[PDB]
Design an enzyme around this catalytic site. Sequence first.
Site, PDB file in Angstrom:
ATOM      1  N   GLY A  14       0.801  -1.220   0.000  1.00  0.00           N
ATOM      2  CA  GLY A  14       0.000   0.000   0.000  1.00  0.00           C
ATOM      3  C   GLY A  14       0.832   1.268   0.000  1.00  0.00           C
ATOM      4  N   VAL A  16       4.251   1.415  -0.219  1.00  0.00           N
ATOM      5  CA  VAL A  16       4.788   0.470   0.755  1.00  0.00           C
ATOM      6  C   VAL A  16       4.924  -0.867   0.033  1.00  0.00           C
ATOM      7  CG1 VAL A  16       4.430  -0.787   2.946  1.00  0.00           C
ATOM      8  CG2 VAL A  16       4.062   1.684   2.863  1.00  0.00           C
ATOM      9  N   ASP A 115      -3.160  10.402  13.688  1.00  0.00           N
ATOM     10  CA  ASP A 115      -3.985   9.794  12.659  1.00  0.00           C
ATOM     11  C   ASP A 115      -4.300   8.341  13.000  1.00  0.00           C
ATOM     12  OD1 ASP A 115      -5.541  10.044  10.260  1.00  0.00           O
ATOM     13  OD2 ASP A 115      -3.845   9.430   8.982  1.00  0.00           O
TER      14      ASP A 115
END
Length: 265
Positions: A14, A16, A115
């Site tokens: 992702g 990544v 987050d």
Amino acid sequence: VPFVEDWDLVQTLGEVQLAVNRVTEEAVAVKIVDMNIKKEICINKMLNHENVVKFYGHRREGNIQYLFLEYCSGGELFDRIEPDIGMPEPDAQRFFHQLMAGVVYLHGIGITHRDIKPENLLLDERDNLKISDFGLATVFRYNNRERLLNKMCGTLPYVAPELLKRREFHAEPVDVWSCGIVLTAMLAGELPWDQPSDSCQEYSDWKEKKTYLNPWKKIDSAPLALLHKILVENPSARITIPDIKKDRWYNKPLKKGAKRPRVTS
Ligand SMILES: N#Cc1cnc(NC(=O)Nc2cc(Cl)ccc2O[C@@H]2CCNC2)cn1
């Protein structure tokens, strides 16, 4: 040992990518950033906890930065949440315990993630939760002095209401709120509102204690009592993590140990 430094990029996670060592077959996650990243590397070099994604090192090859991070084969907590259902209460309680251990750790060294959401909560092969992605993370405590935050960061369904209504706010209650939205998602398989504002009807119903509505009617009264203390509009009145650790549902025995092989007679 020759070739021990070579890693094959086998698949996109992702960007990544999953990296595998040529010699040892050790798997790591490689975050590739083609030029905030200098802050992510600095914050990552401070982190060392069983509920936080491990940082192995970094390499700068011109305009591209390579970050060597822990591979979590279980993937995202997000994909363990069944839409409109969630997951069994004992699984959610264990993931919430591990989320708190991780957040206690980060706040303890003066770091706020900013987050927290199921996409950033990863699972290893034993289903141990690991907090990931420190790209939005910052220092809220240095030389034992607290810095109030003012930058609007995060993802709207998970942000605390002060981040939208106040100029400055404390960092720790913002992460506590997002942990409570994560707990809601795990137990109901849905997000309570698009954003925590008075213009948002579902948010007004929650402040009106209309718990007979969704998602709250899908949640047992013991974890819901905990959500009543986390999702408090006033950040100064909101429950702190030391007091989350004393909540009745938090300490309710629900989950059996890892399955361990056994024979009879
Ligand atoms: N920043 C960061 C970071 C640090 N470690 C990561 N480790 C993984 O193992 N990633 C991963 C593994 C699976 Cl099986 C599936 C998705 C993954 O990463 C998701 C994709 C987007 N970011 C989190 C991922 N992202």
